[PDB]
C-alpha cells in the first residue's frame, strides 16, 4: 500500500523554488513519525534539496538519469520504484509535485498537513477528487511559539 505524505499551504501550494517557505516543527515531527522505518520514494528535485539520505528508511529516488550517489536506490519508472520497495506493509511517497501526481492514482492513503499560511510557490499538490477519499483522522492546532501558523493534521483513506 502506497501513501502520500505532504504539507500544503493555501491553494495547495507545496513548494517554492525547491524549498518549503514556512517553519513548522510540529510538521517535521509528524513527518518523521509517519515515515520512520518505511521506504520513501521521492523525485530527483526533492532528493537534491534534502542532500543526505533520510535515516532509518530505504531511500528510492526516481530519475530518468543514472544515479549519482550510492547511498540511495535509483529507479527510472514508477513501477520500478514500487518493485524496489519489496513486500512492506506501507510505502511512503514524499514529493515533489511531479511525483505525487504520478503516485496519486495508486495511493490508498494521504497524510496531509494543512497549513494556514499564505505563500506563493511554483508547485502545487495534485487536485484530488474529494469524493474518493474519507477523512479518518483530523487534528487542528493553533500557532504557538514554535509554530508560527496554525495547522491541521489530516489522514485520508481511499474509499
Ligand X SMILES: NC(=O)c1ccc[n+]([C@@H]2O[C@H](COP(=O)([O-])OP(=O)(O)OC[C@H]3O[C@@H](n4cnc5c(N)ncnc54)[C@H](OP(=O)(O)O)[C@@H]3O)[C@@H](O)[C@H]2O)c1
Placement of cell 511554483 in the chain? 122
Q: Which is nearer to Ca ion, 22 or 133 (CB)?
A: 133
Distance CA 18, CA 11 (A): 17
Q: Is 64 in the site for ligand X (CB under 6 A)?
A: yes
Q: Please, which residue, 78 or 84, has the CB nearer to ligand X?
A: 78
Assess 156 for contact with ligand X (CB under 6 A). Answer: no
Give the range of 58-66, 126-134, 140-148, 151-159 binding ligand X by CB under 6 A.
Answer: 58-66
Select from 8-16, 83-91, 127-135, 137-145 the region that touches ligand X (CB under 6 A): 8-16
Look up residue 145 and give its DSSP letter. Answer: S
- With binding defined as CB under 6 A, does residue 96 bind ligand X? yes
Residue 57 CB burial class (10 angstroms; 0-12, 13-18, ≥19): middle
| DSSP label of 30 | H
DSSP β-bridge partners for residue 114: 8, 152
Q: Is 2 in the site for ligand X (CB under 6 A)?
A: no
> Rule CB under 6 A: is residue 45 a binding residue for ligand X?
yes
- Strand, coil or helix: what is 105? helix
Residues annotated in a binding site for substrate = 5, 27, 52, 57, 113
Amino acid at each position: 500500500m502506497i501513501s502520500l505524505i505532504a504539507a500544503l499551504a493555501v491553494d495547495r501550494v507545496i513548494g517554492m523554488e525547491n524549498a518549503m517557505p514556512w517553519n513548522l516543527p510540529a510538521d517535521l515531527a509528524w513527518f518523521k513519525r509517519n515515515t520512520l522505518d518505511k521506504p520513501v520514494i521521492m523525485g530527483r528535485h526533492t532528493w537534491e534539496s534534502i542532500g543526505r539520505p533520510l535515516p532509518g528508511r530505504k531511500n528510492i529516488i526516481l530519475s530518468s538519469q543514472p544515479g549519482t550517489d550510492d547511498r540511495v536506490t535509483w529507479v527510472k519508472s514508477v513501477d520500478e520504484a514500487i518493485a524496489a520497495c519489496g513486500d512492506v506493509p506501507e510505502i511512503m511517497v514524499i514529493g515533489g509535485g511531479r511525483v505525487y501526481e504520478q503516485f496519486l492514482p495508486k495511493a490508498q492513503k494521504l497524510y496531509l498537513t494543512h497549513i494556514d499560511a499564505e505563500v506563493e510557490g511554483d508547485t502545487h499538490f495534485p487536485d484530488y477528487e474529494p469524493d474518493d477519499w474519507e477523512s479518518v483522522f483530523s487534528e487542528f492546532h493553533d500557532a504557538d511559539a514554535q509554530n508560527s501558523h496554525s495547522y491541521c493534521f489530516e489522514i485520508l483513506e481511499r474509499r
